[PDB]
Amino acid sequence: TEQPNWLMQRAQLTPERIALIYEDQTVTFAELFAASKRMAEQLAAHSVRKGDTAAILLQNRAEMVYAVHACFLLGVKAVLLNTKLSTHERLFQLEDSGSGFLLTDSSFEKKEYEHIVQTIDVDELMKEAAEIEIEAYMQMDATATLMYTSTGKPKGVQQTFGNHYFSAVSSALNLGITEQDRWLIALPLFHISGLSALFKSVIYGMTVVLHQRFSVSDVLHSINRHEVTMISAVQTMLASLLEERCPESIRCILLPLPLLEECREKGFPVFQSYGMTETCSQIVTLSPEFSMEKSAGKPLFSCEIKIEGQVCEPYEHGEIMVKGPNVMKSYFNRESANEASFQNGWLKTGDLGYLDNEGFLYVLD
Amino acid sequence: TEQPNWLMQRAQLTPERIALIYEDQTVTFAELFAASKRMAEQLAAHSVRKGDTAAILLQNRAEMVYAVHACFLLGVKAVLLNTKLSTHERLFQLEDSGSGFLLTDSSFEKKEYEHIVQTIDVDELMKEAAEEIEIEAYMQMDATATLMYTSGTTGKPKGVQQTFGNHYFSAVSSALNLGITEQDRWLIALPLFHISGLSALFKSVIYGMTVVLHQRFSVSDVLHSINRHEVTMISAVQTMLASLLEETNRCPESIRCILLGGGPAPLPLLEECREKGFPVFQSYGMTETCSQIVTLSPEFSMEKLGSAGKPLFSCEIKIERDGQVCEPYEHGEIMVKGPNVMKSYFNRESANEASFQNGWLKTGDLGYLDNEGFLYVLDRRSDLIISGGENIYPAEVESVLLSHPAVAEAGVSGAEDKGKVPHAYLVLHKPVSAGELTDYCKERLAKYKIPAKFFVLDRLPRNASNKLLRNQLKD
Ligand SMILES: Nc1ncnc2c1ncn2[C@@H]1O[C@H](COP(=O)(O)OP(=O)(O)OP(=O)(O)O)[C@@H](O)[C@H]1O
Ligand SMILES: Nc1ncnc2c1ncn2[C@@H]1O[C@H](COP(=O)(O)OP(=O)(O)OP(=O)(O)O)[C@@H](O)[C@H]1O
Ligand SMILES: [Cl-]
Ligand SMILES: [Cl-]
Ligand SMILES: [Cl-]
Ligand SMILES: [Cl-]
Ligand SMILES: [Cl-]
Ligand SMILES: [Cl-]
Ligand SMILES: [Mg+2]
């Protein structure tokens, strides 16, 4: 199975729609495709070729989104390293992933990694002149993105294009799409909650509002300058309900398990969620209509859930197991884990939970 | 490779959303799943077994929706049949599909087919009871779900095998194109045995969206239905659109999308549509692509007169002549590609051979792309007329003949002489000098395209889908 490259096609369809807003600048999908194609050509100098793995160590910046896309446009597996890890946790992942290159800037030490992988500077690269024929097709089964978990030795999740597509498509079926929808990301892009938005973006043709970090003053401000409708966050960011109800603009906040009592019915629409690196973001959600159920919601469309071993009756504890086309086929270079992980199509999550009488998920600490 | 049954799962997730609105009687997804599972067990009692092929012959009713989902839950290929087919045409498709059963009702002549297939009556079937069964919990994406015959406009009708994969991707791409909300409802007033209508049944379970179902298109009933049930989406052909326009000042507030298939809307229909606030999405598509594969948003309606639009997300078009790709505006055959395109015809090897190149399907339509990639559909490759150094595209001519307004229906075929010369066949509102309107044609058409002779009739050779048979006007 295959699909024409999401970014390319998105550009051909609605070229002057806004892809990325970062700082105060704007990128159209026409620009984003042009950006990503340039970088892709400039990496092709440097000997980067189809089939290679390339790691990315960067903060949320326009140039990171180009970087992801330039990899796809080359056919390069991308590894997005967590910048808040120690340098050694990262060197482990570079060797384990088979990375031939690391793309980063001047805020990190390239000398700390040059001994393992050829090192490339984003800004110094953007200035170079280069000749290249892109990959117009994405294979739905090819790995797109290799993301690590971190609880034994972190396993490298092979996230396919297909996984990402079905993740985005299933989230739409669940929350709906709108031509004036805009998603705000104040979370790190190397984490899946933020990487998913990038793919949602090209697939829906939706705008993403990108912030390097979560500043309440600078976030609740750009929500109004830019009319954000969609925002994904953790409890901590939510905690900043300094003002106080929710703007008119916001129709959805996407979420660990909920704390105590909302706080606040008046007046934010908060969606609770259960997901993991292996499910390429959420697989289960709880609509604000029933904020007072617990606790995690029901399975997304096209996805499945059993609390099992074995197959447990309603309201009785067991091992949560997930299934669906948004779930990864296999960990990278983990034969033992792959066999241990999967029972007949299902993924053993290693989590404690049950389903109530109506089939809602309840995750346990 | 596999998904949970969309009806089951929809029933598990949002059990109290309205699935169906028929008459004004409403049916939930829980109720729909129940109805269907019920009907399923009943059918299983008639030796209807997983892997068989039940054909369905029904007017748009709730019981038809049940029957389609039932076949899914039993693992049975559902063949749906055009209820305006002649007995002969109908028996042909029953034989050719390898149908064992024919689910229908008393509105038809059951015993007239009782020799080829085990008939069954939808209503008398609902009355009985049988052993509960299971399940069938999973749709295999690459399995034929439904089998749908083309209209046979250009030869003996082909059976299109439409996979669950196909239907799923058709629903998803359309949603990427049009958006989807909780508040959305879709009104089908065209037959459910047409892909335009059937695909709404799948849009429903997958989105969890209410389908407002009508047994036929009566403009007053539609307008009432639209407002009473707060309909936001409607599928329509050019005549249905022209009628909704006549009977309104402004467009119903509830409506946000009118998906127009079947052919382009002429410029006056559109300006009136823009003046009156009608949001019209023109579209191109076929049975083989499981409804629309190309659409054009209202914003480009006037700017791109005569265009079907651009491909839906995940889908592709291209234009080829003699194996080579075509420059912008260069005429050639429309070819399509996508997860929503059927992978193969049912039992038509010659057609499968000649219609696929590399994942691409040859539609047998001629068209072109403009510099920006917008599609323009000309005409069927088969009804092309070559008056030497042609071409005359009969739809080009026919379009000008309509809007006389003397002309109500117009058709054009090629006679032969010293290469082929265009003849036109007209149905008349009023009387028209002939011509002028040859002069009426002269202004809006190059000299070689104008019809040499004009003939007159009361009806034109149409098949069971009201489609013009141009090869048979010479009669
Ligand atoms: N909202 C949530 N509520 C409860 N538990 C959660 C939630 N989100 C994630 N988890 C837990 O965290 C996991 C997802 O995190 P991730 O997969 O990135 O790391 P991990 O699975 O903890 O680490 P490892 O690589 O060792 O498997 C899930 O297995 C789940 O058990
Ligand atoms: N927007 C449009 N503009 C112009 N022509 C269209 C448009 N939409 C559909 N068509 C025509 O309608 C055809 C689809 O018809 P359908 O598949 O329902 O039966 P059929 O293809 O005519 O029959 P067969 O191929 O078996 O002879 C397309 O091939 C195309 O020729
Ligand atoms: Cl645009
Ligand atoms: Cl959209
Ligand atoms: Cl519900
Ligand atoms: Cl599609
Ligand atoms: Cl929805
Ligand atoms: Cl001549
Ligand atoms: Mg055809």
From Swiss-Prot, chain B:
Family annotation (SUPFAM superfamilies): Acetyl-CoA synthetase-like
Reaction(s) catalysed (UniProt annotation): 2-succinylbenzoate + ATP + CoA = 2-succinylbenzoyl-CoA + AMP + diphosphate
Protein's UniProt keywords contain Nucleotide-binding: yes
Disulfide bonds: none
Keywords: ATP-binding, Ligase, Menaquinone biosynthesis, Nucleotide-binding
PROSITE patterns for the chain: AMP_BINDING
Molecular-function GO terms, alphabetical: ATP binding; CoA-ligase activity; o-succinylbenzoate-CoA ligase activity
Main enzyme class: ligase
Biological process according to GO: menaquinone biosynthetic process
InterPro entries registered for this protein in UniProt: AMP-bd_C (IPR025110), AMP-bd_C_sf (IPR045851), AMP-binding_CS (IPR020845), AMP-dep_synth/lig_dom (IPR000873), ANL_N_sf (IPR042099), ATP-dep_AMP-bd_enzyme (IPR050237), MenE (IPR010192)
CDD domains to which the protein is assigned, alphabetical: OSB_CoA_lg
Pathway of action: Quinol/quinone metabolism; 1,4-dihydroxy-2-naphthoate biosynthesis; 1,4-dihydroxy-2-naphthoate from chorismate: step 5/7; Quinol/quinone metabolism; menaquinone biosynthesis
EC annotation from Swiss-Prot or TrEMBL: 6.2.1.26
Family membership: Belongs to the ATP-dependent AMP-binding enzyme family. MenE subfamily.
Record function comment: Converts 2-succinylbenzoate (OSB) to 2-succinylbenzoyl-CoA (OSB-CoA).
The protein's name in its UniProt record: 2-succinylbenzoate--CoA ligase
The organism's taxonomic lineage, starting at the top: Bacteria, Bacillati, Bacillota, Bacilli, Bacillales
